[PDB]
Amino acid sequence: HSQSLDRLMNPLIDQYLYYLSRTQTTGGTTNTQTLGFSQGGPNTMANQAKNWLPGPCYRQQRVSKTSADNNNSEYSWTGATKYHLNGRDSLVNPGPAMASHKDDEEKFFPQSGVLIFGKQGSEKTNVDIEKVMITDEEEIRTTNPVATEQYGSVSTNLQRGNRQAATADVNTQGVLPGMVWQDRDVYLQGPIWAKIPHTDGHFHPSP
Amino acid sequence: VGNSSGNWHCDSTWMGDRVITTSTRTWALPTYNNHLYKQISNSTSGGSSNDNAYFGYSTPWGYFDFNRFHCHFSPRDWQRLINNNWGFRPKRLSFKLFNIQVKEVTQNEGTKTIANNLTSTIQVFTDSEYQLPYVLGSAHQGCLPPFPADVFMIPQYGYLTLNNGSQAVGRSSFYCLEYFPSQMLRTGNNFQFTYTFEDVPFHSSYAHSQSLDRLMNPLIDQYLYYLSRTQTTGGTTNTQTLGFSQGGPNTMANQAKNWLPGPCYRQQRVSKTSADNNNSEYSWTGATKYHLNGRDSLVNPGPAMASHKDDEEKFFPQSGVLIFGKQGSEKTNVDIEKVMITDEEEIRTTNPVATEQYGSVSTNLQRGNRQAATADVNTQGVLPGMVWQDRDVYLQGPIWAKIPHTDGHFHPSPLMGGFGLKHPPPQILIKNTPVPADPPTTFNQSKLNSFITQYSTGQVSVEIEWELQKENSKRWNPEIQYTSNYYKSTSVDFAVNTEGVYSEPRPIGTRYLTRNL
Amino acid sequence: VGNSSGNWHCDSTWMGDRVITTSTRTWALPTYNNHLYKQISNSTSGGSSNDNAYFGYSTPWGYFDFNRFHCHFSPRDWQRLINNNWGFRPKRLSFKLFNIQVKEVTQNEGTKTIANNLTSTIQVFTDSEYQLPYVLGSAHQGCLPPFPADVFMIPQYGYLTLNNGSQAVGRSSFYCLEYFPSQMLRTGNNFQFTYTFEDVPFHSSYAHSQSLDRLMNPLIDQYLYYLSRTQTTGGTTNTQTLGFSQGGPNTMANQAKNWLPGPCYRQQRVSKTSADNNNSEYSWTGATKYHLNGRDSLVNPGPAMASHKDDEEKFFPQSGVLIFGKQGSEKTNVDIEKVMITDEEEIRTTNPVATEQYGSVSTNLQRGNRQAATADVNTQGVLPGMVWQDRDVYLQGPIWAKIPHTDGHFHPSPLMGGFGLKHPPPQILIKNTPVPADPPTTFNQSKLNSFITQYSTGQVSVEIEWELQKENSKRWNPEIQYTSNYYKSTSVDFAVNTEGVYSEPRPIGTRYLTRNL
Ligand SMILES: CO[C@H]1O[C@H](COS(=O)(=O)O)[C@@H](O[C@@H]2O[C@@H](C(=O)O)[C@@H](O[C@H]3O[C@H](COS(=O)(=O)O)[C@@H](O[C@@H]4O[C@H](C(=O)O)[C@@H](O[C@H]5O[C@H](COS(=O)(=O)O)[C@@H](O)[C@H](O)[C@H]5NS(=O)(=O)O)[C@H](O)[C@H]4O)[C@H](OS(=O)(=O)O)[C@H]3NS(=O)(=O)O)[C@H](O)[C@H]2OS(=O)(=O)O)[C@H](O)[C@H]1NS(=O)(=O)O
Ligand SMILES: CO[C@H]1O[C@H](COS(=O)(=O)O)[C@@H](O[C@@H]2O[C@@H](C(=O)O)[C@@H](O[C@H]3O[C@H](COS(=O)(=O)O)[C@@H](O[C@@H]4O[C@H](C(=O)O)[C@@H](O[C@H]5O[C@H](COS(=O)(=O)O)[C@@H](O)[C@H](O)[C@H]5NS(=O)(=O)O)[C@H](O)[C@H]4O)[C@H](OS(=O)(=O)O)[C@H]3NS(=O)(=O)O)[C@H](O)[C@H]2OS(=O)(=O)O)[C@H](O)[C@H]1NS(=O)(=O)O
Ligand SMILES: CO[C@H]1O[C@H](COS(=O)(=O)O)[C@@H](O[C@@H]2O[C@@H](C(=O)O)[C@@H](O[C@H]3O[C@H](COS(=O)(=O)O)[C@@H](O[C@@H]4O[C@H](C(=O)O)[C@@H](O[C@H]5O[C@H](COS(=O)(=O)O)[C@@H](O)[C@H](O)[C@H]5NS(=O)(=O)O)[C@H](O)[C@H]4O)[C@H](OS(=O)(=O)O)[C@H]3NS(=O)(=O)O)[C@H](O)[C@H]2OS(=O)(=O)O)[C@H](O)[C@H]1NS(=O)(=O)O
């Protein structure tokens, strides 16, 4: 896509919709509680009102292709994202569809969130990184969230005179009405099809 | 030149099962960017943070935007639709542009002279193939005004592309609008265009009269048991046990249910009385906001959720509502008596409150020594068995939005309300064709930058046929209708004041009539 | 007067085997020479040398020139044609002129007033008989701009004849353009004209993947011998002998061939890094230049030849290439970062390098005492058995050229690239018809020299149908496509900058796809 899902507006016009812009009178010496509303505009593109949301997420661990940038521990299995089924854990790999990295971060790839092919004649076990070809799912950063970052932030309490506004990071986010996402790419070396399991329930049965 | 191109049709027709709302207005189109496509970025608009960074293009084209309910329905027609129908959806649209005049303003010696140029044209095309960035549905300004008496100016079309800060990436595209087949129109020519909406679900313009967690028979018990008691009650030494009870008319909360409330993405709860809010700047810090490609954006209005619980009108979710602005209200840091905050409380029956946890889930495995722990669910994606209602519509709010061309979308109903369409009414783009001033008498390879100053005006009609779904309520007592309060006021509501300024006093939704769940 | 004459069509249509590229633009025509035919010569332009001497006439007529590939193809369309087709040629053309306005500027008291004159006309004729000097194909300026958003002014038509210095010879002819049947057009009238191209060879838009001197089987030897050894090798006293070897996979240079490289006319080799060039003014002295009737002219770009050998991008033939200029680049002594020098290196397979000898030939008869001498062939005309490729096309370069009406022409393909045509699209000439100011009230035999100042504007469309020759490559590995580099830039390529100025960053040729020889 040539447009980002969060930049589908007209950059010359403002909106006719307001948003909580200011909560505290700015200065005096004694700035107090207030409520100011602004109209989304070409300068506040982040605060504007949107009709859609990014595709679903299941956060992944972010490893660097340069081993000097990674923590010195064996987290290949410990720090991995893995579903539980009938008492046993399995690696979510490649997992659902998500962008590999943000802008200007080619060196980083989600731990399991990508398809890793092997160069010709590459061995089977503990082969090094110059013996494999790690795919780059970065062309879907427009609709899908980055595999190695929180999906969003949600309010975790009720702010009041004494209690202040707390918020949490959303690592796993199932679909919601209004979401839109793209599916994983295909790869001339990758699979073509997969049988949709014979179950009585399947959501968006794309492999 | 000496013959009108069309007539003024601006009234609604009710045919029982459908209503055709026509609306004519007078517009004015100036020459934008002085006929140039200029590249714009957050740095040209005076720089910004990374969350507000952008890269797009301004074009010399204006565009017509009739994507608001008040451009079509009058406050009376809207009330006649809201009090009698259970649902409605648009069926076909018919846009017409006529009575075009291309005036040529020549400012010489402080004295302004405006004369009509009968030979000048305007180009107007409609992207029926959706090959251009769709800008409508972002709730921008520049709509046919709500009051038919006034004339509006046509907004400028500009689009955005991919960016990496204020810079352009490889995939950033440049679309020349002059590369599409426009239709030159002199005074005397008219533009007609028809469109028929795809099959979209009716907008549920009713509230439910039953709560999703009270759909039982209050006189009968269930034949299903539930863990009622876990500890022998008293003795002195109450110990571990297991008692099961049958759900009944007194334990309505413990009974067994077949359905669950709609999905949630928790919001921060602010009070309309600023003395009840924490004294900090949490407009951006305490907000719920999705992350996309490294930059955060406000979830606003976000997905569909109830505004507050029972008897708490003062509280509203920070972003979870549509906030319109009263007439003439400014643009920045306007106070709360200058806006109209909508109340999405009629969906507390199926949708969870925007400012409260969705549920509680067990976080461990209770045992002899470990005791039962539980967590609060702030964000909850859909699950088999969920049921929810979509956001209301608001006679001042949007009508439709283009469903993004992706290969995956769940329940593509727009979060701002309206009808999600894969092929929405196309964008009608229009500009004044350039008319060069006298060129040199010797050839210069350089493009001509001197133009005759002009702007065009004329009328525009937009007829939309809506399908209705009449209310067949078999209820006994009277319902809740939208009514203008009978008390005497200084000025009538939805009318012009003593200065000729039309104003809509409050935001009117559709959910008035009730229906069972 | 109050009705448009045409619409704005400016898009391409791909039908598999052909592509129809339409392109509408807005023009402006001033009154040239104040409606007079003036005789011009090198002496009126400020005198010159004998090589630059000329004698011609200026006329009050302007002419339309759409002889450039960028007037028809957009950078995207050109890429879709360059990456998928092996050849292309034009089939039919359809020129249309409409929405004409004849404004009348009256400058009184420093205040300029421009009003439309509805009764004024313009004359426009097309020389379909080629009775006028053909001026298009000389790569002049005044083309429909490449970007459709901008308006251009129409160039002035003037022609040259025979001369003897700044003077006219007996055969010098004077052509009055008013002596042809024009077509007066008021506002409201339009000019339509159709043309169908003769049968011209497809333009080979592919590179060869094999070198003309490596078309053998590298595993087999030949059954043909060649003089391999002439002197018994060592002893101490090596003497005269005659040894013959068979060409083989190791002596690929000595093998026998059926073909020869295309013709040559050697060029001087200059380096893009001025520190590598001799410190002298050899722009004219060291140039290759043909002699004609006593005066020298630069062979530029000259016939078709490769620019450099392998791994020598820095070097380019002095005249042997097309040098375009970046946007806004000046006219005189502009530096090398202000131009874009094309690279004709994809034809090193068949054509000899422009800056090297063609071959070596024996210049004497070796004997017992005289030894074998040889010379370097700088200029080599065609010979039976030669094969060569023609110069590339360049989305900014010319499309066609009229083949001169002579009784002898060899391989009439234009040296600047394009399609050589004997009957090229005719020249559409257009001028504003004179409108005299108020004449005396008493008869004066003298022609009226006072005219109403006016200029005309309007739109012009040009539709061309091109026949394509789809690529059927049975190659296994991927080819070389033209692609916009994926890295992030400040501004998109082939797009408008932040000031609305469209610019083509580099010269795009056609030879991307490869094919065997
Ligand atoms: C960890 O638990 C411990 O801390 C949490 C909070 O901290 S935390 O978030 O960091 O974890 C405590 O939980 C919060 O507070 C609870 C509590 O204080 O009981 C409870 O608050 C909600 O309900 C409270 C009582 O409501 S009531 O309807 O049942 O009475 C309420 O506080 C009461 O406010 C009312 C009020 O303002 O109206 C007071 O009533 C008084 O005025 C009324 C109207 O006034 S008027 O002028 O006459 O018009 C009169 O009608 C009434 O007669 C009068 N009562 S009187 O006795 O003073 O005369 C009442 O006195 C207050 O107790 C909370 O409202 S608030 O006003 O305090 O802001 C209300 N929540 S809120 O409105 O959303 O703020 C909640 O469970 C919880 O709320 S919270 O805001 O989300 O945090 C927890 O209790 C505490 N437990 S502990 O660890 O065991 O110590
Ligand atoms: C933070 O980590 C630390 O604390 C957590 C818990 O605390 S927390 O929740 O607050 O964070 C610890 O994690 C919990 O406990 C773990 C543990 O104790 O190892 C582990 O428990 C699960 O597995 C245990 C061992 O199972 S086994 O199949 O591998 O052996 C188990 O405890 C064992 O119970 C069995 C049993 O009851 O059967 C005992 O076996 C004995 O009886 C068997 C049958 O008896 S019979 O009469 O002969 O029929 C015999 O066959 C067997 O031979 C005999 N063994 S013997 O050596 O005593 O002779 C066995 O001894 C016990 O160790 C847990 O069951 S339980 O019985 O203890 O309740 C079982 N989980 S459970 O059944 O669901 O309760 C889990 O990882 C975890 O469980 S939890 O309940 O979810 O909490 C963590 O280990 C601890 N680590 S630390 O921080 O590093 O110190
Ligand atoms: C710049 O000019 C000067 O130098 C050039 C050459 O130098 S350069 O190339 O660097 O510029 C001279 O030009 C070359 O030489 C010319 C020349 O020597 O006259 C001339 O040579 C060609 O013709 C010569 C005469 O031919 S003839 O048929 O007219 O007689 C010839 O030399 C003669 O060779 C014959 C021969 O070998 O047959 C000799 O004849 C003798 O034998 C014959 C057969 O023998 S057999 O055993 O009986 O069977 C007998 O029949 C004959 O009776 C007998 N004659 S006898 O008098 O000795 O008894 C004859 O004597 C020779 O003169 C050249 O052949 S060659 O044998 O010398 O190799 C022949 N060219 S060749 O055969 O292709 O080599 C040419 O014009 C030219 O030739 S070249 O090889 O291309 O260079 C130039 O003359 C000189 N002029 S100057 O500057 O004014 O001093």
Side-chain angles (χ1 to χ4, degrees):
Chain A
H1 283 129
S2 61
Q3 284 194 295
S4 191
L5 184 268
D6 69 313
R7 290 281 183 280
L8 299 179
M9 325 96 12
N10 185 306
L12 301 307
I13 317 299
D14 307 65
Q15 287 195 148
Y16 55 73
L17 252 32
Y18 292 72
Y19 66 87
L20 232 205
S21 171
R22 189 160 53 56
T23 283
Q24 201 184 61
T25 75
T26 51
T29 50
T30 188
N31 48 42
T32 66
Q33 316 128 314
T34 196
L35 286 181
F37 298 88
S38 296
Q39 235 163 48
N43 281 37
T44 70
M45 316 268 256
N47 304 78
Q48 294 194 196
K50 278 95 175 196
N51 282 296
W52 321 102
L53 299 153
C57 179
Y58 198 58
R59 191 170 186 181
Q60 218 96 203
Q61 181 48 278
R62 180 198 65 172
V63 327
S64 172
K65 290 181 179 63
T66 65
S67 56
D69 281 291
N70 309 309
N71 182 276
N72 188 308
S73 62
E74 186 64 69
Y75 55 84
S76 67
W77 178 256
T78 303
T81 72
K82 41 189 150 61
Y83 68 79
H84 205 56
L85 219 209
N86 186 51
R88 76 164 76 94
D89 290 288
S90 294
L91 217 58
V92 166
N93 163 41
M98 286 176 288
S100 281
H101 53 76
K102 312 183 303 185
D103 283 297
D104 306 302
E105 305 197 310
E106 316 298 302
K107 48 131 56 175
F108 294 119
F109 71 88
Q111 177 166 170
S112 306
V114 281
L115 291 185
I116 298 166
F117 298 103
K119 287 179 184 167
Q120 182 62 59
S122 62
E123 299 298 302
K124 164 185 174 52
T125 305
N126 291 166
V127 102
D128 54 88
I129 193 166
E130 245 66 16
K131 294 288 175 55
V132 303
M133 307 174 289
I134 299 175
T135 67
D136 204 310
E137 288 292 302
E138 64 117 288
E139 71 282 301
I140 61 185
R141 296 176 307 206
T142 60
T143 30
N144 296 51
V146 177
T148 63
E149 297 196 303
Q150 83 274 180
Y151 174 82
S153 308
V154 300
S155 187
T156 53
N157 68 172
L158 294 175
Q159 62 84 47
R160 179 174 53 188
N162 52 293
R163 249 186 317 182
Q164 76 134 51
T167 200
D169 258 48
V170 179
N171 302 302
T172 165
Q173 179 62 62
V175 293
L176 290 154
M179 284 197 174
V180 300
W181 66 84
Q182 282 258 290
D183 291 311
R184 188 174 300 282
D185 208 355
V186 287
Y187 303 116
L188 164 81
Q189 301 92 189
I192 299 185
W193 67 76
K195 185 188 192 304
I196 294 174
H198 197 290
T199 45
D200 49 42
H202 32 244
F203 181 61
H204 209 70
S206 186
Chain B
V1 172
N3 290 297
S4 66
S5 306
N7 296 318
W8 187 285
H9 289 294
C10 185
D11 64 306
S12 306
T13 305
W14 301 74
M15 292 142 268
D17 172 279
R18 67 184 57 276
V19 54
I20 302 178
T21 55
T22 315
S23 69
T24 306
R25 254 63 160 186
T26 298
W27 49 274
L29 211 205
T31 36
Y32 288 125
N33 290 336
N34 194 192
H35 304 109
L36 296 177
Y37 287 69
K38 304 193 301 187
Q39 175 220 81
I40 63 181
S41 55
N42 68 74
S43 62
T44 74
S45 70
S48 58
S49 54
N50 183 55
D51 298 356
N52 296 179
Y54 69 93
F55 182 86
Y57 291 84
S58 299
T59 71
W61 301 74
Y63 65 102
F64 291 94
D65 190 61
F66 42 75
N67 184 182
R68 277 237 247 177
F69 278 110
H70 67 195
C71 301
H72 308 293
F73 291 97
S74 65
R76 178 74 188 77
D77 284 62
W78 181 257
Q79 161 181 57
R80 167 158 45 213
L81 159 94
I82 259 41
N83 294 334
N84 316 302
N85 307 288
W86 270 341
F88 70 113
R89 63 174 170 189
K91 295 239 69 64
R92 44 151 284 278
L93 165 142
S94 182
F95 178 97
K96 185 181 311 187
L97 196 48
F98 53 103
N99 280 153
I100 295 163
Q101 299 164 70
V102 186
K103 325 243 67 188
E104 166 199 4
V105 39
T106 170
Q107 176 58 296
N108 272 308
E109 323 122 303
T111 55
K112 184 167 305 310
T113 303
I114 297 173
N116 33 60
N117 194 313
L118 316 163
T119 69
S120 294
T121 75
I122 65 166
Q123 316 173 211
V124 46
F125 79 108
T126 172
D127 71 305
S128 309
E129 306 295 307
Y130 310 93
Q131 303 167 65
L132 282 173
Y134 199 73
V135 152
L136 319 179
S138 293
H140 287 304
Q141 312 190 68
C143 267
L144 313 188
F147 195 46
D150 60 303
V151 18
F152 69 113
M153 90 180 278
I154 302 178
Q156 193 193 334
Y157 182 77
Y159 53 100
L160 294 176
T161 16
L162 297 174
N163 66 298
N164 189 309
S166 66
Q167 290 176 72
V169 176
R171 308 190 164 301
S172 311
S173 56
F174 170 58
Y175 286 90
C176 184
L177 286 263
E178 298 280 7
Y179 191 61
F180 290 72
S182 308
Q183 179 186 312
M184 326 270 270
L185 304 176
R186 276 182 175 182
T187 81
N189 292 66
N190 48 276
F191 177 77
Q192 178 82 52
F193 151 79
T194 317
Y195 167 85
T196 170
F197 294 78
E198 55 179 66
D199 217 63
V200 59
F202 279 80
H203 178 69
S204 57
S205 69
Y206 58 74
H208 283 129
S209 61
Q210 284 194 295
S211 191
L212 184 268
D213 69 313
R214 290 281 183 280
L215 299 179
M216 325 96 12
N217 185 306
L219 301 307
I220 317 299
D221 307 65
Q222 287 195 148
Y223 55 73
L224 252 32
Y225 292 72
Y226 66 87
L227 232 205
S228 171
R229 189 160 53 56
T230 283
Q231 201 184 61
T232 75
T233 51
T236 50
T237 188
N238 48 42
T239 66
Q240 316 128 314
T241 196
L242 286 181
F244 298 88
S245 296
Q246 235 163 48
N250 281 37
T251 70
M252 316 268 256
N254 304 78
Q255 294 194 196
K257 278 95 175 196
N258 282 296
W259 321 102
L260 299 153
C264 179
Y265 198 58
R266 191 170 186 181
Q267 218 96 203
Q268 181 48 278
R269 180 198 65 172
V270 327
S271 172
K272 290 181 179 63
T273 65
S274 56
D276 281 291
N277 309 309
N278 182 276
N279 188 308
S280 62
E281 186 64 69
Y282 55 84
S283 67
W284 178 256
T285 303
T288 72
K289 41 189 150 61
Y290 68 79
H291 205 56
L292 219 209
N293 186 51
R295 76 164 76 94
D296 290 288
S297 294
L298 217 58
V299 166
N300 163 41
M305 286 176 288
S307 281
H308 53 76
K309 312 183 303 185
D310 283 297
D311 306 302
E312 305 197 310
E313 316 298 302
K314 48 131 56 175
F315 294 119
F316 71 88
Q318 177 166 170
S319 306
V321 281
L322 291 185
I323 298 166
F324 298 103
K326 287 179 184 167
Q327 182 62 59
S329 62
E330 299 298 302
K331 164 185 174 52
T332 305
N333 291 166
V334 102
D335 54 88
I336 193 166
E337 245 66 16
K338 294 288 175 55
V339 303
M340 307 174 289
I341 299 175
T342 67
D343 204 310
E344 288 292 302
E345 64 117 288
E346 71 282 301
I347 61 185
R348 296 176 307 206
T349 60
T350 30
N351 296 51
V353 177
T355 63
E356 297 196 303
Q357 83 274 180
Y358 174 82
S360 308
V361 300
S362 187
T363 53
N364 68 172
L365 294 175
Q366 62 84 47
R367 179 174 53 188
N369 52 293
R370 249 186 317 182
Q371 76 134 51
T374 200
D376 258 48
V377 179
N378 302 302
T379 165
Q380 179 62 62
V382 293
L383 290 154
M386 284 197 174
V387 300
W388 66 84
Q389 282 258 290
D390 291 311
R391 188 174 300 282
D392 208 355
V393 287
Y394 303 116
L395 164 81
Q396 301 92 189
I399 299 185
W400 67 76
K402 185 188 192 304
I403 294 174
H405 197 290
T406 45
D407 49 42
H409 32 244
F410 181 61
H411 209 70
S413 186
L415 298 184
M416 268 164 47
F419 301 92
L421 300 175
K422 287 197 172 63
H423 301 298
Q427 322 185 73
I428 324 290
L429 284 116
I430 170 179
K431 76 174 288 193
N432 299 297
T433 290
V435 181
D438 50 306
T441 302
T442 54
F443 178 67
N444 192 191
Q445 68 151 306
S446 178
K447 73 176 176 186
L448 304 185
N449 267 309
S450 181
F451 298 108
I452 287 175
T453 302
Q454 57 179 47
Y455 70 98
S456 48
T457 76
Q459 278 71 50
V460 61
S461 302
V462 187
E463 178 169 57
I464 301 191
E465 178 188 293
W466 307 78
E467 188 175 359
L468 306 166
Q469 193 172 74
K470 199 188 70 299
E471 115 270 48
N472 194 53
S473 59
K474 205 64 169 295
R475 171 178 173 153
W476 177 270
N477 59 142
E479 296 212 52
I480 291 179
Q481 304 293 69
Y482 172 73
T483 161
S484 283
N485 290 163
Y486 207 155
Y487 68 74
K488 52 181 281 286
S489 57
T490 295
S491 59
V492 183
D493 287 307
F494 290 104
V496 289
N497 64 173
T498 186
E499 302 280 295
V501 186
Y502 175 77
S503 61
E504 325 186 68
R506 65 190 58 70
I508 307 170
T510 48
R511 278 59 173 297
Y512 279 96
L513 286 171
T514 56
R515 184 177 191 176
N516 295 310
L517 187 36
Chain C
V1 172
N3 290 297
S4 66
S5 306
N7 296 318
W8 187 285
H9 289 294
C10 185
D11 64 306
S12 306
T13 305
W14 301 74
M15 292 142 268
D17 172 279
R18 67 184 57 276
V19 54
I20 302 178
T21 55
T22 315
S23 69
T24 306
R25 254 63 160 186
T26 298
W27 49 274
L29 211 205
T31 36
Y32 288 125
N33 290 336
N34 194 192
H35 304 109
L36 296 177
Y37 287 69
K38 304 193 301 187
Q39 175 220 81
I40 63 181
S41 55
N42 68 74
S43 62
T44 74
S45 70
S48 58
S49 54
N50 183 55
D51 298 356
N52 296 179
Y54 69 93
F55 182 86
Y57 291 84
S58 299
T59 71
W61 301 74
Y63 65 102
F64 291 94
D65 190 61
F66 42 75
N67 184 182
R68 277 237 247 177
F69 278 110
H70 67 195
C71 301
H72 308 293
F73 291 97
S74 65
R76 178 74 188 77
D77 284 62
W78 181 257
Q79 161 181 57
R80 167 158 45 213
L81 159 94
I82 259 41
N83 294 334
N84 316 302
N85 307 288
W86 270 341
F88 70 113
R89 63 174 170 189
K91 295 239 69 64
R92 44 151 284 278
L93 165 142
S94 182
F95 178 97
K96 185 181 311 187
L97 196 48
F98 53 103
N99 280 153
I100 295 163
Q101 299 164 70
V102 186
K103 325 243 67 188
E104 166 199 4
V105 39
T106 170
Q107 176 58 296
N108 272 307
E109 323 122 303
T111 55
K112 184 167 305 310
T113 303
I114 297 173
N116 33 60
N117 194 313
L118 316 163
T119 69
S120 294
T121 75
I122 65 166
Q123 316 173 211
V124 46
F125 79 108
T126 172
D127 71 305
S128 309
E129 306 295 307
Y130 310 93
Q131 303 167 65
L132 282 173
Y134 199 73
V135 152
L136 319 179
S138 293
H140 287 304
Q141 312 190 68
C143 267
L144 313 188
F147 195 46
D150 60 303
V151 18
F152 69 113
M153 90 180 278
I154 302 178
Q156 193 193 334
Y157 182 77
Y159 53 100
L160 294 176
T161 16
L162 298 174
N163 66 298
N164 189 309
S166 66
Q167 290 176 72
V169 176
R171 308 190 164 301
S172 311
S173 56
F174 170 58
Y175 286 90
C176 184
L177 286 263
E178 298 280 7
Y179 191 61
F180 290 72
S182 308
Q183 179 186 312
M184 326 270 270
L185 304 176
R186 276 182 175 182
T187 81
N189 292 66
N190 48 276
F191 177 77
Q192 178 82 52
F193 151 79
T194 317
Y195 167 85
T196 170
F197 294 78
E198 55 179 66
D199 217 63
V200 59
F202 279 80
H203 178 69
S204 57
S205 69
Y206 58 74
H208 283 129
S209 61
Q210 284 194 295
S211 191
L212 184 268
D213 69 313
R214 290 281 183 280
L215 299 179
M216 325 96 12
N217 185 306
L219 301 307
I220 317 298
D221 307 65
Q222 287 195 148
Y223 55 73
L224 252 32
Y225 292 72
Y226 66 87
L227 232 205
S228 171
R229 189 160 53 56
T230 283
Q231 201 184 61
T232 75
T233 51
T236 50
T237 188
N238 48 42
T239 66
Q240 316 128 314
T241 196
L242 286 181
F244 298 88
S245 296
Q246 235 163 48
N250 281 37
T251 70
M252 316 268 256
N254 304 78
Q255 294 194 196
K257 278 95 175 196
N258 282 296
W259 321 102
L260 299 153
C264 179
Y265 198 58
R266 191 170 186 181
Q267 218 96 203
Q268 181 48 278
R269 180 198 65 172
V270 327
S271 172
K272 290 181 179 63
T273 65
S274 56
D276 281 291
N277 309 309
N278 182 276
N279 188 308
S280 62
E281 186 64 69
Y282 55 84
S283 67
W284 178 256
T285 303
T288 72
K289 41 189 150 61
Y290 68 79
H291 205 56
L292 219 209
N293 186 51
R295 76 164 76 94
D296 290 288
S297 294
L298 217 58
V299 166
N300 163 41
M305 286 176 288
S307 281
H308 53 76
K309 312 183 303 185
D310 283 297
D311 306 302
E312 305 197 310
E313 316 298 302
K314 48 131 56 175
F315 294 119
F316 71 88
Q318 177 166 170
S319 306
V321 281
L322 291 185
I323 298 166
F324 298 103
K326 287 179 184 167
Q327 182 62 59
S329 62
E330 299 298 302
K331 164 185 174 52
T332 305
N333 291 166
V334 102
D335 54 88
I336 193 166
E337 245 66 16
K338 294 288 175 55
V339 303
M340 307 174 289
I341 299 175
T342 67
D343 204 310
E344 288 292 302
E345 64 117 288
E346 71 282 301
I347 61 185
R348 296 176 307 206
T349 60
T350 30
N351 296 51
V353 177
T355 63
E356 297 196 303
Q357 83 274 180
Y358 174 82
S360 308
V361 300
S362 187
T363 53
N364 68 172
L365 294 175
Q366 62 84 47
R367 179 174 53 188
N369 52 293
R370 249 186 317 182
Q371 76 134 51
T374 200
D376 258 48
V377 179
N378 302 302
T379 165
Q380 179 62 62
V382 293
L383 290 154
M386 284 197 174
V387 300
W388 66 84
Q389 282 258 290
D390 291 311
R391 188 174 300 282
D392 208 355
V393 287
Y394 303 116
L395 164 81
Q396 301 92 189
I399 299 185
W400 67 76
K402 185 188 192 304
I403 294 174
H405 197 290
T406 45
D407 49 42
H409 32 244
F410 181 61
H411 209 70
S413 186
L415 298 184
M416 268 164 47
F419 301 92
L421 300 175
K422 287 197 172 63
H423 301 298
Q427 322 185 73
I428 324 290
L429 284 116
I430 170 179
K431 76 174 288 193
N432 299 297
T433 290
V435 181
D438 50 306
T441 302
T442 54
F443 178 67
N444 192 191
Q445 68 151 306
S446 178
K447 73 176 176 186
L448 304 185
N449 267 309
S450 181
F451 298 108
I452 287 175
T453 302
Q454 57 179 47
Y455 70 98
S456 48
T457 76
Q459 278 71 50
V460 61
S461 302
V462 187
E463 178 169 57
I464 301 191
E465 178 188 293
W466 307 78
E467 188 175 359
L468 306 166
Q469 193 172 74
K470 199 188 70 299
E471 115 270 48
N472 194 54
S473 59
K474 205 64 169 295
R475 171 178 173 153
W476 177 270
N477 59 142
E479 296 212 52
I480 291 179
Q481 304 293 69
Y482 172 73
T483 161
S484 283
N485 290 163
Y486 207 155
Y487 68 74
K488 52 181 281 286
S489 57
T490 295
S491 59
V492 183
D493 287 307
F494 290 104
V496 289
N497 64 173
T498 186
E499 302 280 295
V501 186
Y502 175 77
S503 61
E504 325 186 68
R506 65 190 58 70
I508 307 170
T510 48
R511 278 59 173 297
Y512 279 96
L513 286 171
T514 56
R515 184 177 191 176
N516 295 310
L517 187 36

